[PDB]
Amino acid sequence: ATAAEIAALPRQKVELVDPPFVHAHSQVAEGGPKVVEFTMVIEEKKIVIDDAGTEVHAMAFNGTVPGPLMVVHQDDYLELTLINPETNTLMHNIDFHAATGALGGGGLTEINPGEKTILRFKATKPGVFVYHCAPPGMVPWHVVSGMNGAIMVLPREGLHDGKGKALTYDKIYYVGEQDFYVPRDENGKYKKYEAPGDAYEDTVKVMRTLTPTHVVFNGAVGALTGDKAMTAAVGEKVLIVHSQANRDTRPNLIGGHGDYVWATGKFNTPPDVDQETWFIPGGAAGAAFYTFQQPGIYAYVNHNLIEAFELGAAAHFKVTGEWNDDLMTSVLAPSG
Amino acid sequence: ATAAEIAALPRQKVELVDPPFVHAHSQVAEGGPKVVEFTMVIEEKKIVIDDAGTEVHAMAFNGTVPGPLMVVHQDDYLELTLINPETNTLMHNIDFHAATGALGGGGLTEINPGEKTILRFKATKPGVFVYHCAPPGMVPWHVVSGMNGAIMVLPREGLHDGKGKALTYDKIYYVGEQDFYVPRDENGKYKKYEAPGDAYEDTVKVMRTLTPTHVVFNGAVGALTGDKAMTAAVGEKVLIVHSQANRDTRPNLIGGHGDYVWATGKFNTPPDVDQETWFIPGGAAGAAFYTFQQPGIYAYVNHNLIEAFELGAAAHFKVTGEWNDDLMTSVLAPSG
Amino acid sequence: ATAAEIAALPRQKVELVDPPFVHAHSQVAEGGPKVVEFTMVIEEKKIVIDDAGTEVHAMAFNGTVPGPLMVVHQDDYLELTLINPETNTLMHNIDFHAATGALGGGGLTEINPGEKTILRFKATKPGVFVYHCAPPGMVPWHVVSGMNGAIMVLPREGLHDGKGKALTYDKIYYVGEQDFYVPRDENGKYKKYEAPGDAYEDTVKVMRTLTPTHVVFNGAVGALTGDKAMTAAVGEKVLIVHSQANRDTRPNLIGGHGDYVWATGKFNTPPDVDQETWFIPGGAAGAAFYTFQQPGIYAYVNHNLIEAFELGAAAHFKVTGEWNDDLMTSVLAPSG
Ligand SMILES: O=N[O-]
Ligand SMILES: O=N[O-]
Ligand SMILES: O=N[O-]
Ligand SMILES: [Cu+2]
Ligand SMILES: [Cu+2]
Ligand SMILES: [Cu+2]
Ligand SMILES: [Cu+2]
Ligand SMILES: [Cu+2]
Numbered sequence A, B, C: 001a002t003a004a005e006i007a008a009l010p011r012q013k014v015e016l017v018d019p020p021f022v023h024a025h026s027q028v029a030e031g032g033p034k035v036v037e038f039t040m041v042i043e044e045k046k047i048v049i050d051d052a053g054t055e056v057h058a059m060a061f062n063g064t065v066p067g068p069l070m071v072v073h074q075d076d077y078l079e080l081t082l083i084n085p086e087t088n089t090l091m092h093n094i095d096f097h098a099a100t101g102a103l104g105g106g107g108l109t110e111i112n113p114g115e116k117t118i119l120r121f122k123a124t125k126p127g128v129f130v131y132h133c134a135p136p137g138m139v140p141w142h143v144v145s146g147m148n149g150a151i152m153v154l155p156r157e158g159l160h161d162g163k164g165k166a167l168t169y170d171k172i173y174y175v176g177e178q179d180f181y182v183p184r185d186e187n188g189k190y191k192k193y194e195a196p197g198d199a200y201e202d203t204v205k206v207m208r209t210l211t212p213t214h215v216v217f218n219g220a221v222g223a224l225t226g227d228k229a230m231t232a233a234v235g236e237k238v239l240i241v242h243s244q245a246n247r248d249t250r251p252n253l254i255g256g257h258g259d260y261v262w263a264t265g266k267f268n269t270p271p272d273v274d275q276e277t278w279f280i281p282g283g284a285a286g287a288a289f290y291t292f293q294q295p296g297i298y299a300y301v302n303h304n305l306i307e308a309f310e311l312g313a314a315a316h317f318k319v320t321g322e323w324n325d326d327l328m329t330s331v332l333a334p335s336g
């Protein structure tokens, strides 16, 4: 492309929405390449992650853990204005696994409190990708403190299955999975700290055991269950984007399946089909497409069941509709 | 199909066999869809898992760990009669990852000791799938007490490679891998209990470390060696089904290979080929197809060698036949 | 082929080079099948793996960790002369995952100090494969002491993508990743031992936690950084072979991508494309192909960031050339 051409492309600002929801977008690109603008303010803040009042000094892109999903199409440019308020105490930056060059952008976006920066990159590869903060020397600490999210770079013509047939979803959810490593005192009680840096030494010791104290979705145990369960209806097509910036996970829609799963998260890699449990390595995002056939409650979990039911990696889906006795039926209900 | 159409389908009662063997079946479906009937009695029993006399309070479908492999064909119906003896102490149920609806069937099959239930579901997706108990509130505990197994839903036309060429096996084996979390006393000695519930609190603490004390095949260290080593002969085609309902595994046939491996366990997903070590995420089953070319003993392991040789994840294959010097030969035997 | 036919085949002696470099070879095979000859002397030796001076009694093929990459073409024969010097104290052998029979060669190459052996096998399957020592009863200990490496069996027609188009690399690097389990004293300080045998009991204890103290590339923290960082240029095509003989890893080229990744390491299995982070299960080798588009420093890591930045699994690439502002540009540098 020429220099003037890039400068002449339309610029479009988008209003982000907090996970698990996703901002307005079209599956098939509308018009030619655009420079899609996003702005995110970094917020260091204490959040409670379990039912025992356990605290973590989160480092949250846009104030949420995970950071929000940004959606663009292949060959659009993503132009992000990143802000680090003077009220914060640490330097931060951002690495887009979707980008090319300067460590994904980390080398060009190091901002101290009181500073901002604007990074632009061409989304040349289609798929869902992880993005995360990565200050040299303290990379895992920022990432396991919740400073990561994902973006989706849709093919300009939308999604397709391995045979080239269109796959159009009715709704999309973004489930960011987070491994936390919270220090405990000799009595086994989780410790609280006045400032983020105060917990650094204690936190790294726990990180080295490679064993998280919590593994959660949307920043807390149960954040996506109960009255916050995701929803769908029989017949509805749903895309579930899942990311884990630091550790492996194995998603499974209990009661359902992954009809088409881009396990590696890259759309040019044909999707696996009829999946029970898929695998997303730490440092990546993946996406699963499913058409609901049965109403009721479903569980969506990291299928190491200890991580899901003891550590927190479990969400729910409430589905409306009519039951299908052909697919499943209780011939004889539990009885003496 | 309507309830009437289903009621008219032929029915076939299958008699299950203990792993690693698989009940009689035909790779290519014989006739149209039918309701395949199975029965399994749940047995809470003590099992010894290592040569130090270590005990586990197993919760075993059909009395074995793993539960038996159930085989049907795509679009047949699987009708399971599940029984929970009055002699047992806990409520149990069953979730088939192969099924669609009510958490895989667990929501319709919760049975207290003294009860039974009959669940029918349509096997709409081809492949190997995990099945496991999942009582609300105590899911991982039952699964890591051995209450899990798998089923195989064969394509009606049998197996095929990525280009459609038929793949017909001479023998099939089912290796169920189990991660156990046995509590120890302050002297590093494994503890024993007189009841399942008695070990609950202690076990959950070990489960949370995400570090199993034992990782075994067919319920115990060395279970599939010696009197129980699997067999084959040079030239024979063997399908090795492998499942792990809670934790990741990486199977590898030492001395052999995975000629065709449906690593995700789903038959509509083309198999990987010429594999040395494949990967099966916790919560799934996979299947490898191999034609033996060399006689002798083979070791089949989870290739995290510590898990295989320190923790117990190792099985043996004794293969008969003529040695092939073209493939491998000792030009010079170990010598001065 | 008969013994006579093989004996008539041409023979080529190859000089091995130390990782991460690879001995000279041709991507497209030169002529017909050949007996490719390699010689490796095993050296039990003390090595330092970090800046603090932590010692490990390595068991090293060719004196390095990982052992060197051997390259042949499909259907060539690999003839290895393996020597166990009388200065060593343990018995050693070798299992080539690329071979067929006798536990990969392990059952035919057990040599005590002062002995040697020559093993020949036909490289029937294309791909990168792990090779490692495996003495009955002491398997994981030799492997996690560094006694493993990899080989590459190139298709006779060189590499191609999943659609048949040729993929020709300009450079190739072999990154061997090693999980180490070093004992610590009551002060949390790593222990040193006079003889390798002295460390066995303490080491096995650490091995059983399934938590390595160090995870490194080319035998040491920072081994592939600074003056030893890998190098490339904008426009250059690089193949990165990565192996892990005992534990899972998830490689990621920070700032770049895996344009084509044979994640399972087998060339007849179509490669995934546009990868951010790929996955190689313990007990296997994988390979990624990338054409650099941006100059500057890149980090190549196991993307569980704790393993990368706390445990040692991070390498660097220095890349020469012109920055591409179309791909990425800082619209606004960090500022107030
Ligand atoms: O930016 N490091 O993955
Ligand atoms: O039924 N939970 O895997
Ligand atoms: O030779 N054991 O993987
Ligand atoms: Cu940060
Ligand atoms: Cu990254
Ligand atoms: Cu149960
Ligand atoms: Cu399940
Ligand atoms: Cu050795």
Ligand SMILES: [Cu+2]
Pocket: B252, B254, C095, C097, C132, C283
């Ligand atoms: Cu091996």
